[PDB]
Structure 1
Amino acid sequence: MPTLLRVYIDGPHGMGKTTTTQLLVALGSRDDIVYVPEPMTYWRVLGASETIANIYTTQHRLDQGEISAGDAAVVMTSAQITMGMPYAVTDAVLAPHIGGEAPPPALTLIFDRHPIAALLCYPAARYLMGSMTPQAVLAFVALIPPTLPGTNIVLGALPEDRHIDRLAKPGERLDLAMLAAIRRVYGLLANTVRYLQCGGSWREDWGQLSGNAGPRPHIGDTLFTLFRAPELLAPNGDLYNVFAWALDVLAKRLRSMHVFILDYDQSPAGCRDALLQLTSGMVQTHVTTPGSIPTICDLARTFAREMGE
């Protein structure tokens, strides 16, 4: 029974994730490590017209006082559903091939981002920016697919000052406020997994909210803190049950994830070797049939050819 290692490189854009990944795939053998790359093609052409460009234009207009929140919200919600579609189909066709958690893997699968990037992280950041409702953020949360065994997610670390300079180097605009928001979000996320793996329970700690490594963070330091918003609160001050249930889904999805932190404050070859060492402590899985491996290989290869830049 052959084995599989899946690794999702995620976190805020502009750190160097894409390069580092490509650098890592390059060191490997042709037929034992594949890359599912960033689907910019879907973003700029196939899915719609310059989705990246559309998003930053609308945020800028909202800030400039040129459209209202409600208007910006519907534009952001649409574009983001679109942004995330390739991650979602990929997860869906792959799911049946994944077995139980399990010596060198017969195949390593590297992903540019994980479904929560588009179904949770960026939405949450847009909400912080005032360009998306928390209800819609939670509707995205409710559609996060089941976390499969051996979900290794690598997030980035990088000083803000250096992050600002590197990013200043699609259709994007330099939105420091966005950068700050997405940085905060991925920060809460890493805390949240830690919070949940240390047996934390958002229901039991909900009142404490108001005005891989380490100890259990405070609930105020996790994603749960974002959804203490008046839109989601009943008169009695509690969360409406429907929203509570989506927080439950959030906990169920995150708690079983293996989070790793990668330092991007170094050269491109540095990040690569850092990442390589980091893989040996990652959870592998068995596949479900013998032919899962070449099948998985074709899908990843098919994807890159079509959607990678």
Structure 2
Amino acid sequence: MPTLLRVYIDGPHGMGKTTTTQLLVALGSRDDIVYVPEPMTYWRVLGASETIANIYTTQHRLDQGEISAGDAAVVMTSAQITMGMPYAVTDAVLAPHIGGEAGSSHAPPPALTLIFDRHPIAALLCYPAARYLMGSMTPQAVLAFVALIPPTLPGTNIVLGALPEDRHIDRLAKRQRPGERLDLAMLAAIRRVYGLLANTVRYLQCGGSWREDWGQLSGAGPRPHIGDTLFTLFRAPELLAPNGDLYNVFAWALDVLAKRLRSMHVFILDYDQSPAGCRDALLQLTSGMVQTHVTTPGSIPTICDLARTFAREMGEAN
């Protein structure tokens, strides 16, 4: 009955997302805005040892032809499960607290705002999809992940980043992070997937039916072409039955994708500015966003305790 605003800031790495969310949270209150960070200590210590290094080394060895596609795929798939775990778990313990649409739009101020560094679909859809484009994951495994994306509840606000390629390359080339290797092909792949993601949500919200438009696959705003959405990635010989039809297991995975993305509220944040500019731009975007009621009166303190515990335990140390 108190209201909740949830805001997931996501998109390609290297844009300044992590900075922007911290600056926003810093704008004060503490008792009514909390940050759920990238679970770096999960990735690097708790779930497995140095998963980030494992990911970039695995692609490097593939690129150098030191390991096969199949061997790259099993390492990448398994690493991506480690990557997604904290997100999946958080979403699962949060879900029963989330009630109906409240409004924000002409509604009062949230009793609590949670700013997430990334949504579950980052590790369950977007990075797996980019790794597919990089030759280190199979499309079957990507759809296996899709089938496991948790139900999208009301008030799922996703903020995705925009940045010119040239500035983004520059931002990545300056960035130094344990185990990451500078890979401009992966950059291109991940930028593309998140572009497709934005288009997919618009497509679905404009009443798009991927089954209606499937034959059109070949090679804010108006309705996008299915070829500009994520559906375009899954018209691949490995998934096609002896008749050009998608095997039913795969077509159902795409139905799930549509059911998971359609309910999302997407916003685009311009990262081509100062850290404080990015913060205030984000601030403006939030005022209009969809809030929800929570399901119990003790829901707010519990959610707050969850977020702070998560941050302390899995947020970057040292």
Fold-level similarity (TM above 0.5)? yes
Deviation at 1:280, TM superposition (A): 1.1
Counterpart CA distance in 2 for 1:164 and 1:257 is: 29
- 4+ aligned runs moved over 2 Å, structure 1: none
Instruction: Give TM-score, length-normalised by structure 1.
Output: 0.99
Counterpart CA distance in 2 for 1:216 and 1:288 is: 35
Deviation at 1:65, TM superposition (A): 0.8
Residue aligned with 2:85, SS? helix
Alignment match of 1:190 (pick from 175, 191, 198): 198
Q: Spell out, residue by residue over 1:13-54, the C-alpha distance to the aligned partner (whole angstroms, 9 max, x if none).
A: 010000000000000301000011111000111111100001
* 2:165 corresponds to 1:160: yes
Residue aligned with 2:211, SS? helix
Counterpart CA distance in 2 for 1:38 and 1:221 is: 29
Residue aligned with 1:5, SS? strand
* 2:27 corresponds to 1:27: yes
Deviation at 1:3, TM superposition (A): 0.3
Residue aligned with 1:246, SS? helix
Deviates more, 1:163-172 or 1:240-249: 163-172
Q: Spell out, residue by residue over 1:117-171, the C-alpha distance to the aligned partner (whole angstroms, 9 max, x if none).
A: 0000000000000000000000000000000110000000000010000011131
Instruction: Give TM-score, length-normalised by structure 2.
Output: 0.96
Residue aligned with 2:137, SS? coil
RMSD of equivalent CA atoms:
0.7
Counterpart CA distance in 2 for 1:163 and 1:87 is: 25
Residue aligned with 1:210, SS? coil
Residue aligned with 2:161, SS? strand
Deviation at 1:210, TM superposition (A): 1.5
Q: Spell out, residue by residue over 1:254-280, the C-alpha distance to the aligned partner (whole angstroms, 9 max, x if none).
A: 000000000000000000000000001
Residue aligned with 2:153, SS? coil
Residue aligned with 1:109, SS? strand
Tell me how many residue pairs correspond in the alignment: 308
Q: Spell out, residue by residue over 1:94-124, the C-alpha distance to the aligned partner (whole angstroms, 9 max, x if none).
A: 0000000081111101100000000000000
Q: Spell out, residue by residue over 1:70-97, the C-alpha distance to the aligned partner (whole angstroms, 9 max, x if none).
A: 0000000000000000000000000000
Counterpart CA distance in 2 for 1:21 and 1:79 is: 26
Alignment match of 1:209 (pick from 208, 217, 221): 217
Residue aligned with 1:41, SS? helix
Counterpart CA distance in 2 for 1:109 and 1:91 is: 12
Deviation at 1:281, TM superposition (A): 1.4
**Paired residue for 1:179?**
187
Residue aligned with 2:30, SS? coil
**Paired residue for 2:104?**
none
Counterpart CA distance in 2 for 1:294 and 1:65 is: 52
Deviates more, 1:81-90 or 1:100-109: 100-109
Residue aligned with 1:23, SS? helix
Gaps of 5+ in 2: 102-106
Q: Spell out, residue by residue over 1:231-255, the C-alpha distance to the aligned partner (whole angstroms, 9 max, x if none).
A: 0000100100100000000000000
Q: How does 1:80-119 map to 2 (within 5 A)?
A: 80-101=80-101, 103-119=108-124
Question: Percent of counterpart pairs with the same letter?
Answer: 100
Residue aligned with 1:105, SS? coil
Counterpart CA distance in 1 for 2:156 and 2:28 is: 21
Deviation at 1:297, TM superposition (A): 0.4
